[model samples]
Target: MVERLLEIIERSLRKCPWLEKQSIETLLEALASEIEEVAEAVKKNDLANLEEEIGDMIYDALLVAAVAQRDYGIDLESAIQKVVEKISHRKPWLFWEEKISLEEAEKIWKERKK
Candidate 1:
């Protein structure tokens, strides 16, 4: 199901000349409003619309990655891999061999262990 949109977005980036023509900052700025819609939906207590906006948000974020990739050859997947590794340190309960309570997990989340 997720691959459907990714593939759709992939081709849109390739064939839709207009999609990749905008400045990165323009699309970067656009993210704020997309987030605003998500917040608005949440405040209104409308889960259905919130769900739709979440999908739109992800789609638009992928577009930002597409722009960055085109401009500087950045790969979003590699960046996310780096983030996951960083998260393992802060979320030791998920990857570490130690036992921890929610209290400890909460502290770990706040103070990064060196």
Candidate 2:
């Protein structure tokens, strides 16, 4: 999937040579627009509209991620891994010991917060 994503980004970069020239804010706006469109479709309970709009939102997210990687050196895979590691470490008692269901883990987390 990473390889295919990289290929897609490369294709996009070739087709849109101005990708590097665009500001981060432009990509951020694009991402936000797609997300809002998808959310509206979902709220309306439009299955086909929701699916297509959400797919576009995901694509927009990928575009932002790729641009960030190309322009700011933040690889999406590494960022995703770091988030997973942070979540795992944050609940080591539940994760490391493997002694709870997800629901139980949530309960424990709430108790811990309290």
Q: How many residue pairs clash in all the candidates, one count each? A: 0, 0
Model 2 TM: 0.73
> Worst lDDT window (10 residues) for model 1?
89-98
Cα lDDT of candidate 2 equals 0.79
lDDT of 1 by residue, 1-114 (tens): 768987987897789878867877888877777899999999999999999899888888887888888788888899889889898877868966878898989988888865
Q: Give the clashing residue pairs of candidate 1, or none.
A: none
Q: Candidates' TM-scores?
A: 0.84, 0.73
Local error of candidate 2 at 52, Å? 0.6
Candidate 1's error at 81, in angstroms? Answer: 0.8
| Candidate 2 lDDT, 43-64, residue by residue in tens | 9999999988977887778888
RMSD of 2: 3.6
Q: Give the winner by TM-score.
A: 1
